Structure 1
Amino acid sequence: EAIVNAQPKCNPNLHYWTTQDEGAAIGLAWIPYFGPAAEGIYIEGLMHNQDGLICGLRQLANETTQALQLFLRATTELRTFSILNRKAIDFLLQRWGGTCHILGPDCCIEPADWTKNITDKIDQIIHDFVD
């Protein structure tokens, strides 16, 4: 599906915050005893609406809510951390969960370079045929 922003307004710029899971630490700052407190672990960035991505993202988060709320209603887990890992698993199962039939629409195997090896070795058998 396509994303149709149907919101009263859109802030076209995204002033965002996040963490860093392997920031190149200076000296001993990676040690919890010496490192920053909870308030000082964030990095910031600013992103503009190139390709309409910011206004599309605001609509995407809005449209995601019904499915996410229904998922949360049905889980017994108090805090859910596994959504992204499960989507990665489903990504793999969609492609590799069964037998990969080469040249099929659901098998992501490209034999082209090895077509240009098998067809490129016919002139080692049909060329070499002197008698």
Structure 2
Amino acid sequence: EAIVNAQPKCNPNLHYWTTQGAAIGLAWIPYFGPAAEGIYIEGLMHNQDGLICGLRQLANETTQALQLFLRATTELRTFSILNRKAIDFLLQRWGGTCHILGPDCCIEPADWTKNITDKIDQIIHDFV
């Protein structure tokens, strides 16, 4: 589905913070490095392609499924959601036998048709 923002308002700019990378000198050593308050980088994203307003709606609509997932787990703190998505991505494409040219099978023999279409000019090319 495409995402339809249906909020009272939208802040179209995302002034974000996150954690980082290539350190300077000894700054990677916990004893010498930043405190908890000083590990963050900042950036600013504008609403190109409506992605920011869409993102706000997406986070909003994610909440029900996320909460139902949290209700059903017994882990006190959940860190594995994205890793499990990565696994499920792989299982979707490669969890069974990949039938070449089938719709659920991600192998392209485009060049390898060409490599044997060039090999039609192999024997009855030179069929002297």
Percent of aligned positions with the same letter in both sequences?
100
Query: Tell me, which stretches of 5 or more residues in structure 2 are unaligned?
Result: none
Higher mean C-alpha displacement, 88-97 vs 120-129: 120-129
Encode CA deviations 1:100-120: one digit per residue, 9 max, x unaligned.
000000000000000001111
Alpha-carbon distance in structure 2 between the residues aligned to 1:124 and 1:93: 40
Three-state SS of the structure 1 residue aligned to 2:64 is: helix
- Cα shift at 1:122: 0.8
**Match for residue 121 of structure 2?**
123
Higher mean C-alpha displacement, 45-54 vs 115-124: 115-124
Three-state SS of the structure 2 residue aligned to 1:44 is: strand
Three-state SS of the structure 2 residue aligned to 1:116 is: helix
**Match for residue 7 of structure 1?**
7
- Cα shift at 1:124: 1.2
Encode CA deviations 1:75-99: one digit per residue, 9 max, x unaligned.
0000000000000000000000000
Three-state SS of the structure 1 residue aligned to 2:70 is: helix
Alpha-carbon distance in structure 2 between the residues aligned to 1:124 and 1:98: 36
Alpha-carbon distance in structure 2 between the residues aligned to 1:85 and 1:42: 23
User: Number of aligned pairs?
Assistant: 128
- Cα shift at 1:43: 0.1
- Cα shift at 1:70: 0.1
Query: Tell me, which stretches of 5 or more residues in structure 1 are unaligned?
Result: none
**RMSD of aligned C-alpha atoms?**
0.4
Superposed structure 1 runs of 4+ greater than 6 Å apart:
none
Instruction: Return the match for 2:49 from 48, 51, 55.
Output: 51
Alpha-carbon distance in structure 2 between the residues aligned to 1:37 and 1:122: 68
Encode CA deviations 1:35-70: one digit per residue, 9 max, x unaligned.
000000000000000000000000000000000000
